[PDB]
Amino acid sequence: TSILDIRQGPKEPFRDYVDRFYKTLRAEQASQEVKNWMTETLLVQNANPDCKTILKALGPGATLEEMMTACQGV
Amino acid sequence: TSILDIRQGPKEPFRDYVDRFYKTLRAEQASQEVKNWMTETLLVQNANPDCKTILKALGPGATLEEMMTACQGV
C-alpha cells in the first residue's frame, strides 16, 4: 500500500490513523526533509473533516502530543 | 485516565480501589509532599458512602493496614 492511500476513516480515531501513518512512513526510505514535508502535509490532508477542523485551530508549530490530545473526543 | 477520575464503586471493595489508586499514583510524577496530600485527601473523598462513613470513624493518623482491615465487610 502507498503512503497517499493512507487516510482517516469517518469513525476512526486519529490515534489509530497516526499509527498507520508512521508505520507506512517507516517503509518509506526518502530524504528526511521530504519525510518532514510528508508529515506536515499529508497527515492533516487525509485526516477526517471533524478532526481536520480541530487541527486547523491548533495552527502551525504544533507537536504530536498536542495533536493527539487535540483530536481525542472526535 | 486521570487520578481525579479514580473512584470507588458502590459494590467495589475498597481494597480493589486502593490498588487502582497506587497504580495511578504510580503514574503520577509530582513532588512527594503533593503525593502525600493526594493520599490523605483524594482516596477518602472518592471512597463510597458506606466505607467513607467507616473511614471518618478511624480519625486522622490512620495507616493503610488499619484502613484496609477497617473497610473489609463493606
Place this chain on the structure above:
Amino acid sequence: TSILDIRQGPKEPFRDYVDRFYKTLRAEQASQEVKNWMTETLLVQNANPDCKTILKALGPGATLEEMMTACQGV
C-alpha cells in the same frame, strides 16, 4: 509433483504461483543454464491467459519485480 505440473489457476494470483515455481525449482537439482531456460520458458507458458497476455507486453529482458508488479491486478 513434477515442475511441468506447476501451473497458474484461472483466479490464482501470479504471485502465489511464482512462489510455487521457485519452491519446486528449489527441488530441481539441474545445471544453472537449464534452470535459466526453465525460468524464462515454463513460468510464462503455464501462466493464466489474462496475465499471460500482460507478460507478453513486458517483452524480453524483464525482471521479477517488474513481472510481479505487472500482473498484480489480474
Place this chain on the structure above:
Amino acid sequence: PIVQNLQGQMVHQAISPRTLNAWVKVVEEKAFSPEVIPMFSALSEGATPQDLNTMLNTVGGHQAAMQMLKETINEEAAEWDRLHPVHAGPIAPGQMREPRGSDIAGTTSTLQEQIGWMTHNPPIPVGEIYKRWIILGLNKIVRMYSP
C-alpha cells in the same frame, strides 16, 4: 555492550539473542506500562548508543509513540549541542574529539569511537546521557498514554 574481561580490561561483547527477545517480549506484553522503565534500565546496563538504537529500531508497532520518542531524542540532542558549544580551535593529535548530540545518539559516531570515550581516562557517560533522554521521553509517553 562494553563489559569487563577476565584480564581486567573493558572490551566490547555483543548482546545476547534471549536478551534481545526479552526486550521484545517486555514491549509486547506491557506496552507503555511503567515497569517498562526499570526493566529497560536493567537490560541497558553497560549498553552503547549503538545498542540503544538497535533496541529502538527493532520495535514493531506503537509507531506514534516511536515517532514521539525520536523527536524527543532529537530535541534532547539539539539541546545537548546548544548547552555544550564546540571547543576552541583545532582538535589535538594527542586527543580525541568532544561528542555532539548526534554522537550521543550514536548517529555520527562509530563503535570504536563510542568505546574510545567510555574506556578512556576520564571516561564520558554518553550512555547515561542518552538513557536520561530515553527515560524522559518514556515519561512523556507514559503520561500521554495514561487514559
Place this chain on the structure above:
Amino acid sequence: PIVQNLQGQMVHQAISPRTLNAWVKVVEEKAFSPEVIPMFSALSEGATPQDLNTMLNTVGGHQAAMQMLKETINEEAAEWDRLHPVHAGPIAPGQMREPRGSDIAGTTSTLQEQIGWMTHNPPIPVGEIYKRWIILGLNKIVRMYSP
C-alpha cells in the same frame, strides 16, 4: 563466525542452534517486515559468507523473494567484479589472492580463505560487502512487498 578468543586472537567458532532457531523464528513471524533488517544485522555480527549462505539456504517458504534476493546477490557480485578488475601479473608467494564477487558470496572461497582475508593485516571486510548487498536486496523486497 570469527570471534576473539581469551588468548587475544581471532579464531573461528560455530554459530549456536538457538541462534539458528532465533533466525528461523524471526522469518516465520515477521516475514518481510522492516524489523527483520536490524535483527539480521545483530545476528550477523562477526559472521562469515559461509554463515550468511547457511542462513539464506536454511529459509523455507517465500521462494519468490528468495529467488529475487539470489539474483540481487549475483548482480551485486557481477558489479563487484566489474568495479574491481583483477590485478597485474601472477599472484606473489608471500601474499594471498584478492577476492572476486563469488569469493564475497562465499561460493569460490573456502573457510580458511575467508578467515585469511578477515584476520590478516590489513583485513578486508567481505562480510560487510555481502551485508550491504543483503540489506540492499532487503530494501528491494520490503519495497515490493509493501501492499
Place this chain on the structure above:
Amino acid sequence: PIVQNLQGQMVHQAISPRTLNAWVKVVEEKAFSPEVIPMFSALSEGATPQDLNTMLNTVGGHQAAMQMLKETINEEAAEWDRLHPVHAGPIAPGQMREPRGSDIAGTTSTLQEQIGWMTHNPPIPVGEIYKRWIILGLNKIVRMYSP
C-alpha cells in the same frame, strides 16, 4: 565431534543434548523438506562417523526412507572399496592403516581410529566422504518423496 581446544590442539568433545534434540525436532517438523540438508550440514560441522550413525540410528519413523538411505550408504561404501583398492604389502609399524567403506561408515573403525585419521598430518576427511553419501542419499529421498 572433534573440536579445537583452547591449548591449540584438536580433541574430541561430545555432542550436546539440545543439539541432539534440535536434530530430532527438525526431522519431526520438516520430514523430507530440502531445508533439512543445509540444516544437517550445519549440525554436522566437525562431526565423526560415529556421531553421524548416532544421528541416523536415533531417527523414529520414516523407515522406508531410513532403509533406502542405509542401502545408499552401503552402495556408496561398496563403491569406495571398489575405487580405492587396498595398498601394497603389509601395514608399516610407523604408519596407520588406510580406511575402507566400512571405516568411513564408522562400522569397522573405533573412535580413536577416527580421531587418528582426521587429526593426523595429512588428515583424511572421512566425515566429508560420508557427508556426500548422506547428501546424495538425501537427494534420492527428496526426489522420491516429492509428490
